[PDB]
Amino acid sequence: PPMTASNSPATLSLARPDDWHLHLRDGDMLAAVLPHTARQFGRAIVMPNLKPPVTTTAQAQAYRERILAALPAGMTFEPLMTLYLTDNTPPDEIRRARESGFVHGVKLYPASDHGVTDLAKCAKTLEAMQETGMPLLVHGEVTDASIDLFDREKVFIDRVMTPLRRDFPGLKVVFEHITTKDAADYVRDADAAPGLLGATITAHHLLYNRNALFVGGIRPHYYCLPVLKRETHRVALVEAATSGNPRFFLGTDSAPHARDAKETACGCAGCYTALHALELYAEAFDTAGALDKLEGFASFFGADFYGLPRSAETVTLRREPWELPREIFAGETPVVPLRGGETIGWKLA
Ligand SMILES: [Ca+2]
Ligand SMILES: [Ca+2]
Ligand SMILES: [Zn+2]
Ligand SMILES: [Zn+2]
Structure with a gap:
């Protein structure tokens, strides 16, 4: 189909990428969304915020088995597990997680x-993380109700990240899903030894x-x-993601909820992007x-941060249009993909 004159590349090939921040959920939802991830990505960091949360290495082991049980037979995918940090997580859990071979980070969520x-409650455990090389993955927001959400x-x-990195200067930290110029600049310009600071x-x-x-109503x-930020912040994130700086890498934060948990008086937070990330x-x-930058960001820099090999497999994105489904089903339960119903301009071959 002849491109218009203004219409860079018809395809893009790259080493098989990875998703360094993913919510797979559990049960029927897990069964439905895992194949969407596994088509696109060789590995993912599987977040631990189940109900109840994955706080122990044995819990992570059991969750890993459930994920592998749901992986359709032709597909290759390795789940990189995480623990949910708590006030009571002991150093002993850090050591058994490191030694298990399948736990690749510990996640800190705001309470x-x-x-x-x-976080002062977790000092000995942070010490063990620093000692063992277990990275801390941080959802970097305060919960303080007197602070505007944005x-x-x-x-x-200022309140948490700076003291944390000062008090534990050998601890590997990932600033998850950064959304602001403030965070991008913080990561980009931080004085940090190689491999000590990353961001998704x-x-x-x-x-x-x-x-x-x-747009046209609340969505x-x-x-x-x-939350999504001002345009000025979005511009800064695009600049960071397309920079080639090795500290920034791909994490979808794909976070599915049933449609009926989104379209209610108190809608759950999370965008579903694993179908089409x-x-x-x-x-x-x-x-x-900057399509020439996608490989670094998607395929190389997160693997490097986590000490895992870059993929020897090649995948290919084709600039073909396709109409996203409005709903994907978890058994009988529909999930709306972000932009479901719309026609997007790329398709993974
Ligand atoms: Ca404002
Ligand atoms: Ca603005
Ligand atoms: Zn988060
Ligand atoms: Zn998340």
Whole structure:
């Protein structure tokens, strides 16, 4: 089909990429969304926020088996497990996680057996992480109700991230799903030894700004944490994601909820992008004139951070149009993909 004159590349080939921040959920939902990830990505960091959370290495082991049981037979995918940090997580769990071979990070969520009320409670365990090389993956927002929602990431940098890296200068840290110029600049310019600081960037925070939440009506399927920010912030994230700087790498934060949990009086946070993540990223990188940067960001830098080999497999994105389904089903339960119903411009071959 002849391109218009203004219409860079018809395909893009790259080493098989990985998803360094993923929610696979459990049971029927897991069965439905895992194949979407496994088509696109060789490995993913599987987040631990089940109900109840995955706080122990044995829990992670059992969750890993459930994921492998749901992996359709032709597909190759390795789940890289995580623990949910809590006030009561002991150093002993850190050591058994490191030794298990299948736990690749410990996640810190804002708020004692189910989460962290004060990070000062976790000192000995952070020490063990530093000793063992277990990275801390951080959802970097304060919860302080006197702080405007849009400021909570910037405030976390000053209140928590800076003291953390000062107090544990050998601890490997990933600033998850950064959304602001503040965070991008923080990571980009930080004095850090190689491999000590990384950050993940979602497809949705590259493509949208907060106006998307309110176009023509309130749009719960576009609602996630951290929330979409001002356009100025989105521009900064695109600049970071297309920079070639080895500290930034791909994490979808694909976070599915049933449609009926999104379209209610108190809609759950999370965008579902595992069906079409690579295609969304391809759109963003294409718009930026930087498709030649997608490989580094998607395929190399997160593997490098986590000490895992770069893939010997090649995959190919084709600039062909396709109409996204409005709904994908978890048994009888529908999940709306971000942009479901719309026609996007790339398809993974
Ligand atoms: Ca404002
Ligand atoms: Ca703006
Ligand atoms: Zn998060
Ligand atoms: Zn997440």
